[PDB]
């Protein structure tokens, strides 16, 4: 569980925001892309795995699970690629509530930024630093350090 | 010390690789951009500060220290923007040796990737996971967790 992440793709302004959530902490990384292709998802997973110790990724949909480009990046980076079936139905609701929270944040910053990508990175910053108290950025570091120890 | 990062800009293939180094661990993040502008540097710092607790950034040159766009991003993200003067001459050599190591790695992967950006993210992954023994990615998590606790 220190190494488990969930992909999530949501849409705004006719663009796609791809998110990776560290399931045990709720810390996220995200980017804006024009569309959700196996090449864009594969590159995003390569970035993520170079920055945190990603053991397993639950893909966001069947097309990213099938994509041989995504499987190729998961092989390269040493990630176990898994499906994203919500056997725990709580997963469905957590993801939905997270997307609604990020879009709320993005609305709150949106007029400080000309481009959507800036607003999404402002929202990643606000989400990860929010204390709910520890923040998600503190929880992720704690969880992984405890694992390393 | 847990919150101190150094920016570094190096060139390959006619493109610019912008790197942020977490000084106490040697962990890095990096990206490829067509050229090193204050807007590109500001967006990179906004990304980095949403992902790790960035207290202080030593800028890589005087143009990024002066840039009001960079200062605007460091204000937004709560980062102290500092110069990059190597008062400890050991700094110069550490950075030069890191750029040579990264280019070495990029060359060892370069033929697995069509685009430079893929090779650079492969190099970030190899650098951060290399055991020298702990890796830089282990050291950064330990350092920050120790600070949090």
């Amino acid at each position: 569980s220190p190494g488990i992440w969930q992909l999530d793709c949501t849409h705004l302004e006719g663009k796609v925001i791809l998110v990776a959530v560290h399931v045990a902490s709720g810390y996220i990384e995200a980017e804006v892309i024009p569309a959700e292709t196996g090449q864009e998802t594969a590159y995003f997973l390569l970035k993520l795995a170079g920055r945190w110790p990603v053991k397993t990724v639950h893909t966001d949909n069947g097309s990213n699970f099938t994509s041989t480009t995504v499987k190729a990046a998961c092989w390269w980076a040493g990630i176990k690629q898994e499906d994203g079936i919500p056997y725990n139905p709580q997963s469905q609701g957590v993801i939905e509530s997270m997307n609604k929270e990020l879009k709320k944040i993005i609305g709150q910053v949106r007029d400080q930024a000309e481009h959507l990508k800036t607003a999404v990175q402002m929202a990643v910053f606000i989400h990860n630093h929010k204390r709910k108290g520890y923040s998600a950025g503190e929880r992720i570091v704690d969880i992984i350090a405890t694992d390393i120890q | 010390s847990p919150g101190i990062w150094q920016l570094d800009c190096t060139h390959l293939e006619g493109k610019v690789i912008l790197v942020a180094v977490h000084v106490a661990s040697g962990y890095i993040e990096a990206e490829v951009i067509p050229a090193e502008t204050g807007q590109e540097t500001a967006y990179f710092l906004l990304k980095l500060a949403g992902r790790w607790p960035v207290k202080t950034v030593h800028t890589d040159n005087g143009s990024n220290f002066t840039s009001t766009t960079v200062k605007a991003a460091c204000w937004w993200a709560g980062i102290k923007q500092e110069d990059g003067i190597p008062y400890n001459p050991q700094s110069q050599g550490v950075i030069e040796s890191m750029n040579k190591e990264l280019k070495k790695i990029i060359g060892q992967v370069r033929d697995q990737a069509e685009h430079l950006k893929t090779a650079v993210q492969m190099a970030v992954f190899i650098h951060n996971h290399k055991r020298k023994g702990y890796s830089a990615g282990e050291r950064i998590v330990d350092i920050i967790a120790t600070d949090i606790q």
């Binding site: 090449q39 990046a73 | 697995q112 990737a113 893929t118």
Partner: peptide, 8 residues
């Protein structure tokens, strides 16, 4: 293209 980022 036989590359990780372009399998073609």
């Amino acid at each position: 293209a036989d590359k990780i980022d372009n399998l073609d």
